[PDB]
Amino acid sequence: FDRDRLFSVVSRGVPEELTGLLEYLRWNSKYLTDSAYTEGSTGKTCL
C-alpha cells in the first residue's frame, strides 16, 4: 500500500495533507532505522 519508496509523489506534487505515511507499515523498522532519516531519500528536505 504505502511503499516507503514513494517520497516525491505522496505530497511533493500537490499541496495537500494525507495520512497513511511513514509508520503505516513496518513501524518497528522505521523506528529502528528510518526515524526521520530516510525522508527525501536521506536528503532533499521537504520543508
Q: Total helix count?
A: 1
Question: So what's the oligomer here?
Answer: part of a larger assembly
Radius of gyration: 11 Å
Structural class: little secondary structure
The counted number of beta strands is 0
From the N-terminal CA to the C-terminal CA, the straight-line distance is 25 Å
Characterize the biggest β-sheet: none
Percentage of residues assigned to helices: 10-25%
Order of helices and strands: H
The global form is: globular
How much strand content do the residues show? under 5%
Subcellular location: Cell membrane
Organism: Rattus norvegicus (Rat)
Protein name: Transient receptor potential cation channel, subfamily V, member 2
PDB class: membrane protein
Structure report:
The protein has 47 residues and is mostly loops. It is 15% helix and 0% strand. It is built from one helix and no strands. It has one helix at residues 27-33. The radius of gyration is 11 Å and the shape is globular. The protein starts with 26 loop residues before the first helix and ends in a 14-residue tail after the last helix. It comes from Rattus norvegicus (Rat). This is Transient receptor potential cation channel, subfamily V, member 2. It is found in: Cell membrane. The PDB classes it as membrane protein. Keywords: Temperature sensor, membrane protein. Transient receptor potential cation channel subfamily V member 2,Enhanced green fluorescent protein.
